[PDB]
Amino acid sequence: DYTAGKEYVELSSPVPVSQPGKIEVVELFWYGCPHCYAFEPTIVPWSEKLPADVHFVRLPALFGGIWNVHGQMFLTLISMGVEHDVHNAVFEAIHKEHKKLATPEEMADFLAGKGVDKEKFLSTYNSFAIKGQMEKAKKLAMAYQVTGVPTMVVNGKYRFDIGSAGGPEETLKLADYLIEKERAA
DSSP: OOOBTTTBEEOSSOOOOSSTTSEEEEEEEOTTOHHHHHHHHHHHHHHHTOOTTEEEEEEEOOOSTHHHHHHHHHHHHHHTTOHHHHHHHHHHHHHTSOOOOOSHHHHHHHHHHTTOOHHHHHHHHTSHHHHHHHHHHHHHHHHHTOOSSSEEEETTTEEEEHHHHTSHHHHHHHHHHHHHHHHTO
8 A cells, every 4th residue: 555656666776685585674874863863762673573584774874974984983883793782872972962973083982981992993993894884885875876864775675764654653664564565575
């Protein structure tokens, strides 16, 4: 009962998924995005309930400038295996504390207060591996043809957002439907 062209669109060139064999669900976001921050209370509990044949992943939108800096912070924290602990603190710092987290040094200093090894964070942030992940994330955003956040992509095939779905819970209901659609092939 959803309609292609209305609540979601189908990408003419489907994008490969990060984990072959599971239905992918991507949330594209930016730590500095107030709507992304506001969406967290809805998308987190939902994501924790996803079944085992679904792979949920957050992808930072690398649209330039501060988005890229913040995105590089995200990727560095994921690589370090500590993003999920400090995830909420980063959002809180940017939106409630007015912290800019605009340079690697400001980031390290702040994250150290949250338990994150400063020396490892900085070495990782500047590593070739993270540079490759940034390159991939950029190309992905280009392939999804995403121009704002938060935006969802299901299985590299369907793009939608809170506006198109008609609200944050409606967005997840739409994701559920499209996950089911992809199961059916």
